[PDB]
Every structure is written in C-alpha cells, then in structure tokens.
Design a protein around this ligand. Structure first.
Ligand SMILES: Cc1nc(C)c(-c2ccnc(Nc3ccc(C(F)(F)F)cc3)n2)s1
Lengths: 296, 258, 8
C-alpha cells in the first residue's frame, strides 16, 4: 500500500471511497477501492467477498480487471485497472448533441460480449446501470461494480426486499417470482440501450408499482398469450390497467429497423423468450459495427 | 440456462479440479482426525437448519474448511472456530442475508468471541486467496436434475440427502470429485425410488458411464446402508422433515445390480 | 441442535 500515491477521489459506491492512484515504481495508474474494515460488526462485507471472488475468475476485455487485493489487519484495498469515467457521466455530458449511433452500437456490442462471458461462467451481474458501466478513451466499455453479482450453479433466490435499482429492473422480479435468471441482465441492458439512444431513461419508476406501470405503458400490459403464466405470479393483480403496446418506432425514433428488433427481443416480458446475450451478438444490428472513440 | 448450461457444466468441471482439497490432508494434521471433522460438519448441518440456510451454504462451508485444513495445522480447540468462520463466509457468499456474526458466536456457546470469529474469517479468506465460488455436489445435482424424465421430488431429495451424507466422511469421499459423487448420488436416488438408472443423456453430457461411477457408487451405497448406525445423525434428522418427502425414511436397496 | 461447544 506504500507503493501507491493517491491522486484524487473518483466516486463512492458499495463499501467506501474509490481513488485514482499511481504505482510509484511502475507508473501504472489504478483505481483503489478501499473498504473500511473498522469492521467491528460483521467483518468483510458480503459485497466485497463476491466482487473479489468473481472478478478474480472473470478475465475478459469488457469486464474491468481486478489487479490485486490488499489485505491489512484493519483495511481492505481493491486494486482495479483505471478507466476514465462511467457511462452515466458520458451521457449527461453528451446530452443535447447525443451519443452518435455508431458508438452506442459498439457500446452495446461490447457489453453483450462481457455479459456473455459473465453468464457463461454462471455469474449473474444483477445491477447493470450506466454508473456501473465504465468507459475509456480508446473507446472501450466494461462491466464493473460486481458487488451484487452472484454465482448461479444453483438458481439464485430473489431478494424479498430489493435494494437494487428500480429503473433497470425486470418485470419478472417486479411481479415476485422466486429466482433470478440471466434474463434480468439482458433487460437492464436493453433499458440502457434505449437510454443511450433517446438520451433519457426508459422506465423511471417511483416505486415497485409505478415501475410496473411505466413498463406496461410502453410495452403494454402482459397477458397469458405474451407471457404464459403471468396472471399467476405473486404480485400480479387482476386490476392492472390494460394499456396497449406502443409502436417501438415511437419509443426510439432515432433507431433503424434492426435496432428496434434487438431492443424488443431484449425487452421481452417472458424470461424464457428474452434474447440471450450469446444470441444478441449474432443479431444483424451488429453487422456494420466499428469502434469509434468518444469525445470525452 | 438453456444456452450456457453446457458452457457452465463445462466450466464447473474445470473449476472443481482447481478447488480440490488434498486427499492426504487429514493424516498430516498433527492434532485432528477424520472423526473430529465429522463431528464438525454434522454440527454445521445443525446450524444450517437452526438458522434456516440454503443447502449450498453448507456445501460451500465444508469445501472451504477442507482446503483451509489442507494448508494449516489447527488444534482441536480451534476447529469449531474454523468451521464457524467457514460457515459465516459461505453465508456471506451464498445467502441473501446471512446471520449476524453475533449469532454465529452465540451458536458456539460463546466459546469464542466476535473478534475471534472475525479474525478467523480474515485468515480463512487470506488462505483461500479469496477463491470462494467452488463448485459443489449440490450444484451438479441441480444440473443433473434437469435430465430426469420425468421429474420426481423423492428422487431429488434423496439424491440431495446422499450428497450431504458424503460431506461427513473424508474417507473415502475426498478422493472423489463432486461431479462424480453427484452422479453416484443421482443414480442411487434414481435407483432407489424408481429402479431406473444413470441416464444416457447424462452419460453423454458427463462422459461418465455407469461403470466409471461404480467405485464411488459403492462407498456411497455402503454409507446409505450404514447411516442409521453412523456415529453422526443430524442429516437423517434433517431429511425427515416433510420438506424433503421423508426420503431419509425409505429403505435402502441391499444391492445395486452392478 | 444447535448451541454446542463440540468436545473432541
Ligand atoms: C463503483 C465502482 N467500482 C469500481 C471498481 C469503480 C471503478 C474502477 C476502476 N475505474 C473507475 N474509474 C472511474 C472513472 C471515472 C468515474 C467518473 F465518475 F468520473 F465517471 C468513475 C469511475 N472506477 S467505480
């Protein structure tokens, strides 16, 4: 720990304080996430435990690298490769003029790659959202913040009281089934896809129930045709307004026909039919993909 | 899950290799003994149930313990501690919320202290170099269970129970990979309830022909038969609950037709 | 159950 020079703090999150920091012997610039460990109370957090063990296992160009973990008596340091900012900022700052299609397309492309590496190692991310998606100037994007991810060698039982995120949350969790699935990560990513495009969030809910209702208003109230089995899910109410599904052309104008097909396959109600990440990549939307750099 | 399944199943097989105790570990521990470890896992079962914990948790716990004991001499006074921290950790890894540390201290008859349990957590992490997502039997049973035709709760609960039973006796269960034990347990449970056998779907997926199981299968049978008399009982207890269809009641076959 | 100071 004596080998790093803290430079400047670059965001909070799970546990504590993340620094930009530089290795005084090698010049390498890193991101230190320093976890508090006055832990008179429960010891190493569960989030730390997961993000470390899983990241350890995952090595792929669109999943932020864990470089080292530093164990003291009294503090726990995670050392990550340094990347510049996070998709949330890029968007705020790119607002007005908007993020060029081709860059959107590569960001999506690049994420599906990482999601796919993740999913195909029974890791479930669970909290994809711009702030947890990290970009660099060479124009790569990467999965980050794995503090809630989970290994699914056995189905992953659902958080009865979810402290996660509303806006990116899958209908099927909203309606209270028992398990997660790879499908939830696709959802959050479809929602981030539509965000990059329209320059605003797709389903800005104000509580579990308002969420459902926003989803429904865009995509139309699910019934048993679309989603065999909905009407028998713990939180499903027969009183749910029966809104009709809107022409997607209406929801993401800027988007070519392919973009809409993908987007819809990713935002399918029923987790059995919502498109896998491995699939999405074959999608023709990705025919003409390049790798532009962002103007940061 | 219908897409990676194979990728996953492949990777667990890869992982289970790297996450493996050493077999000889118990005889190189000065002060402790296969017995001693039995007493322990047994105890974990019981904690498992008291705090109502997912089964995987317990499978993890033992796996951590077995690797922790494969690098580190421990004295018998401190085993229950290693176990407590192994359990804490796995609960932290696999449960939605885990028991507080206080409870874990409580459940030992405050034989150790919060700061003791917390210190060991750390050492345990240190020693596993943080590698916690170990494949377990209970994972491969769950992968295996897809290939029933058709499904059958008794069978599942039975295979489970045999699974956990393997947890208790380092001899000879440490010489087997979980994917194998999980097969074994699967064929036995199948066999026992419905007289059917380890299916071609699974033989083709797993590369394990029946005959390749036989070694592991045999010990497991012997175990199934002897469990009512085994020094250690918390599991049989556990697997009486109607939650598990009374399967630990059912009558073991005396022969396997091998 | 449970509460137990395992003697070895
Ligand atoms: C939460 C996060 N957890 C990790 C591991 C984080 C991380 C890891 C590595 N690099 C970075 N860089 C970074 C760079 C810029 C920003 C910001 F805030 F400016 F956009 C935020 C984060 N962030 S943030």
């Amino acid at each position: 720990m004596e080998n790093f020079q803290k430079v400047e703090k670059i965001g909070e999150g799970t546990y504590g304080v993340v620094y930009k920091a530089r290795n005084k012997l090698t010049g390498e610039v890193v991101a230190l996430k320093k976890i508090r460990l006055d832990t008179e109370t429960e010891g190493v957090p569960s989030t730390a435990i997961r993000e470390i063990s899983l990241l350890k296992e995952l090595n792929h160009p669109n999943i932020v690298k864990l470089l080292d973990v530093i164990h003291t008596e009294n503090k726990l340091y995670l050392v990550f490769e340094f990347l510049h900012q996070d998709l949330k900022k890029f968007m705020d700052a790119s607002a007005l003029t908007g993020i060029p299609l081709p860059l959107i397309k590569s960001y999506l492309f690049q994420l599906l790659q990482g999601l796919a590496f993740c999913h195909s190692h029974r890791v479930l991310h669970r909290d994809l959202k711009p702030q947890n998606l990290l970009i660099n100037t060479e124009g790569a994007i990467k999965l980050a913040d794995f503090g809630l991810a989970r290994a699914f060698g056995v189905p992953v039982r659902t958080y009865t009281h979810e402290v996660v995120t509303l806006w990116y949350r899958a209908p099927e969790i909203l309606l209270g089934c028992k398990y997660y699935s790879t499908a939830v990560d696709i959802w959050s990513l479809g929602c981030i896809f539509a965000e990059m495009v329209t320059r605003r969030a797709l389903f800005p809910g104000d509580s579990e129930i308002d969420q459902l209702f926003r989803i429904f208003r865009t995509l139309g109230t699910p019934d048993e045709v679309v989603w065999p089995g909905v009407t028998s899910m713990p939180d499903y109410k027969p009183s749910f307004p029966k809104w009709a599904r809107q022409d997607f052309s209406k929801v993401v104008p800027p988007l070519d026909e392919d973009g809409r097909s993908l987007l819809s396959q990713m935002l399918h109600y029923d987790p059995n039919k919502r498109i896998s990440a491995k699939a999405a990549l074959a999608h023709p939307f990705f025919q003409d993909v390049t790798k532009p750099v962002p103007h940061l | 899950v219908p897409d990676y399944h194979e990728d996953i199943h492949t990777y667990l097989r890869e992982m289970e290799v790297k996450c493996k105790p050493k077999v000889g570990y118990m005889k190189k521990q000065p002060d402790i003994t296969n017995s001693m470890r039995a007493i322990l896992v047994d105890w974990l079962v019981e904690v498992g149930e008291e705090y109502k914990l997912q089964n995987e948790t317990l499978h993890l716990a033992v796996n951590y313990i077995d690797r922790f004991l494969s690098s580190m001499s421990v004295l018998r006074g401190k085993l229950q501690l290693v176990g407590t921290a192994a359990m804490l950790l796995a609960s932290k890894f696999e449960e939605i919320y885990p028991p507080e540390v206080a409870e874990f201290v409580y459940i030992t008859d405050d034989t150790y202290t919060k700061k003791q349990v917390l210190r060991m957590e750390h050492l345990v992490l240190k020693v596993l170099t943080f590698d916690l997502a170990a494949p377990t039997v209970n994972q491969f049973l769950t992968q295996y269970f897809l290939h029933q035709q058709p499904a059958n709760c008794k069978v599942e609960s039975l295979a489970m129970f045999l699974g956990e039973l393997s947890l208790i006796d380092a001899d000879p269960y440490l010489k087997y990979l979980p994917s194998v034990i999980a097969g074994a347990a699967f064929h036995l449970a199948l066999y026992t309830v419905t007289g059917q056998s380890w299916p071609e779907s699974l033989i083709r997926k797993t590369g394990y022909t029946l005959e390749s199981l036989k070694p592991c299968l045999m010990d497991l049978h012997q175990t199934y038969l002897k469990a009512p008399q085994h020094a250690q009982q918390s599991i049989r207890e556990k697997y009486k609950n109607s939650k598990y269809h009374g399967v630990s009641l059912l009558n073991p076959p005396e022969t396997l037709n091998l | 159950a449970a509460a137990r100071s395992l003697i070895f």
